[PDB]
Amino acid sequence: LNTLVSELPEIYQTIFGHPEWDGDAARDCNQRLDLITEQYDNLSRALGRPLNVLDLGCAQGFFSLSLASKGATIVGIDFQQENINVCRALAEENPDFAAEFRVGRIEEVIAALEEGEFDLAIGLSVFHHIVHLHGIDEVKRLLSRLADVTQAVILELAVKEEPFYWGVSQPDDPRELIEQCAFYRLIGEFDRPMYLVSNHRVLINDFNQPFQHWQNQPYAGAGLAHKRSRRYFFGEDYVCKFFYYDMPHGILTAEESQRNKHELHNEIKFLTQPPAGFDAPAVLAHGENAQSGWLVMEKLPGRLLSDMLAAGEEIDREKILGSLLRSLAALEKKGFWHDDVRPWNVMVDARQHARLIDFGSIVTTPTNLVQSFFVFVNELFLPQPWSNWLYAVWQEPVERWNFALLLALFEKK
Ligand SMILES: Nc1ncnc2c1ncn2[C@@H]1O[C@H](COP(=O)(O)OP(=O)(O)OP(=O)(O)O)[C@@H](O)[C@H]1O
Ligand SMILES: C[S@@+](CC[C@H](N)C(=O)[O-])C[C@H]1O[C@@H](n2cnc3c(N)ncnc32)[C@H](O)[C@@H]1O
Ligand SMILES: [Mg+2]
Ligand SMILES: [Mg+2]
């Protein structure tokens, strides 16, 4: 071992189980391990078993042995013979660690990966070299591939502003390397951001679950209103709203950024403590960091009224309207209003019962929202008896218009 460590061109990491070398090492390593193992455990638990882990550019093997040290079956790749020779030496000293090391290039290793081989892959301070060599677009395709064949990827990414010659080749924002992947979240920063990424699972600390589908817009036909700053992930029994407070390319203004904040805090305040006698979807998890915030809630069944109308579906307008008026009256009695009641925020189930979603639209201060509900009634459809209903409402003075009165009048023929 002694000789193998002199044979290293550089001592990059702490050498595992050998404090004699801790001054020679360029990187102290512990702060980043505690974040990596914290995520190892989360995903280990969610999968229900120990993990297969791929350590890309493993250096002197510190992170792979540290993980093998907890039942992980690891593979370590580095393109320097000297590095792996040290890795195996350390692995031989720890003989019951399931630990294997290969001399290889990340580009080829990733190219040859089959889906499921590894649950977790780790790429710390290595992709910048590859961006310099092969370019931004080639590295995005490597990382898409790597995310597709694993459940989770941890990356620590060098940034352009660093005073090295390869800095100029890097994108403006390190998020440019991973924004094409479905899910990403910043989990730390050192002296360099560290991201947890996945194309298969929502990875929040208390909510680690696969998703079947995700979208970068709220509904068919929403356009680009949120400038792609909100992501929506659909599981079996949940929906996760993930809002970025800040985006690459500077595209989100300060006001757009506040909008993402207010709307999310507000929804959480509401769903966390909803007014008695109001069936609101349950909060399964929520949190935020400096970059973003998230809310995970129970998935209501059915389809958006907007899509049912788009597909020309046969709907019961009486049942949709009554159920929707019953809950708007109910909210109103308890001092709440929804300021965005439109087809695309109404979910309709198989029995034609209608529920609101998008509860960040809730305000707690009436006629102006009733007025606007007439646009909704109009989008919904005037035949009778709904022409009479509406004229009955219009005989009252506008100041008197509210949802109790819309509902009362609607219950008379
Ligand atoms: N509880 C839920 N159950 C089922 N689907 C939901 C639920 N919450 C949200 N959705 C779906 O996710 C989409 C986005 O949700 P929502 O409309 O609440 O987000 P938003 O960010 O407020 O967007 P916008 O205000 O632009 O409509 C909805 O259009 C709907 O398809
Ligand atoms: C700066 S280090 C990072 C070490 C370790 N992941 C960490 O952060 O502690 C970069 C490592 O990646 C290896 N490396 C760089 N480019 C590589 C490539 N294309 N293929 C394989 N290994 C590479 C180097 O040999 C070196 O050990
Ligand atoms: Mg909506
Ligand atoms: Mg909304």
Residue numbers in the entry: 5 to 195, 203 to 376, 383 to 398, 418 to 449
What text does the study give?
The chain length of the O9a O-PS is tightly regulated by the WbdD enzyme. WbdD first phosphorylates the terminal non-reducing mannose of the O-PS and then methylates the phosphate, stopping polymerization. The 82 kDa WbdD protein from E. coli O9a comprises 708 residues and contains three domains, an N-terminal methyltransferase (MTase) domain, a kinase domain and a C-terminal domain (residues 460–708) that includes predicted coiled-coil motifs. WbdD is an unusual enzyme since it combines both a phosphate-methyltransferase and a sugar kinase activity.
Removing this C-terminal helix (WbdD459) gave a monomeric protein in crystals (space group P212121) and in solution, confirming that the helical bundle drives trimer formation. The structures of WbdD459 and monomers of WbdD556 are very similar [r.m.s.d. = 1.5 Å (2538 superimposing atoms)], but there is a rigid-body rotation around the hinge connecting the N- and C-lobe within the kinase domain, accounting for the relatively large r.m.s.d. WbdD459, which lacks the C‐terminal bundle‐helix αV, showed a marked decrease in kinase activity but has lost the preference for 2α‐MB over d‐mannose. Thus, the C‐terminal bundle structure is clearly important both for biochemical activity and for polymer (substrate) recognition or co‐ordination. Of our structures, the ‘G-rich’ loop is most clearly defined in the Wbd459 structure, where it fulfils the same role as in Src; co-ordination of the AMPPNP (ATP mimic). However, in WbdD the loop protrudes further into the ATP binding cleft than the corresponding element in Src and it interacts with the catalytic loop through a π-stacking between W355 and Y230. WbdD binds ATP (or AMPPNP) via two Mg2+ ions (denoted Mg1, Mg2) that are co-ordinated by N356, D369 [part of the DFG motif which is almost universally conserved in kinases], E274 and all three phosphate groups of ATP (or AMPPNP), as well as by two water molecules. Mg1 bridges the α- and γ-phosphates, Mg2 the β- and γ-phosphates. We therefore attempted to co-crystallize WbdD556 and WbdD459 with d-mannose (KM > 100 mM) by soaking our crystals in saturated d-mannose solutions (∼ 1.6 M). Only WbdD459 crystals (with AMPPNP) withstood the treatment and gave additional electron density (not present before addition of d-mannose) that we interpret as two mannose units, Fig. 6A. The pocket is occupied by sulphate in the WbdD556 structure, these crystals were grown from ammonium sulphate solutions whereas the pocket is empty (with the loops disordered) in WbdD459 crystals which were grown from a non-sulphate-containing solution.
